[PDB]
From a paper:
All Vaps share a conserved core of about 105 amino acids that folds into a compact eight-stranded antiparallel β-barrel with a unique topology.
Here, we determined the structure of the protease-resistant VapB core in a new crystal form with two molecules in the asymmetric unit. In one of them, the loop regions at the top of the barrel adopt a different conformation from other Vap structures. Okoko and coworkers suggested that Vap proteins may have functions that only manifest upon the conformational changes that frequently accompany the binding of small molecules to proteins. Our new VapB structure reveals that despite the crossover connections, VapB can form a large cavity between the β3–β4 loop and the β7–β8 loop. The bottom of the large VapB cavity is formed by hydrophobic residues (Val96, Phe105, Phe130, Ala153, Leu158 and Ala177), while its side and mouth contain both hydrophobic (for example Ile124 and Val181) and polar (for example Ser98, Gln103, Thr123, Tyr151 and Ser179) residues. The large cavity in VapB contains 12 ordered water molecules (A311, A314, A320, A322, A332, A344, A357, A360, A380, A390, A401 and A403), giving a hint on the size and shape of a putative ligand.
Residue numbers in the entry: 86 to 194
The structure:
């Protein structure tokens, strides 16, 4: 069974880059950058982090992919080999559609 944790965060998007910020358990925060094409905008989201190994998620995440599906947001986390480390399911205040991803990592705050 994967462990479940409350998370919350924000996405801010320019036209060609975006930043994702997620507050997780154990006083850790995820910052990720994605580039490509988006509609400029921003919003908050709240949800659940699912992972079978939180320590490994925080140590080994170097990448994220996301799927924005209206007021649903899915964020998947990966290590440098493309291995899946866990994911977030969240509700987003601001409806957005798109898929993308990029570099990111977890750190203390």
């Amino acid at each position: 069974q994967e462990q479940q944790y409350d998370v919350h965060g924000n996405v801010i998007s320019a036209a060609v880059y975006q930043k994702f910020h997620v507050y997780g358990p154990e006083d850790m925060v995820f910052d990720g950058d994605a580039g490509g094409l988006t509609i400029p905008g921003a919003g908050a989201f709240w949800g659940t982090l699912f992972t079978s190994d939180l320590q490994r998620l925080y140590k080994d995440t170097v990448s994220f992919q996301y799927n924005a599906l209206g007021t649903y947001l899915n964020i998947n986390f990966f290590d440098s080999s493309g291995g899946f480390l866990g994911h977030i399911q969240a509700g987003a205040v601001s409806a957005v559609v798109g898929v993308g991803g990029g570099s990111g990592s977890w750190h203390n705050w």
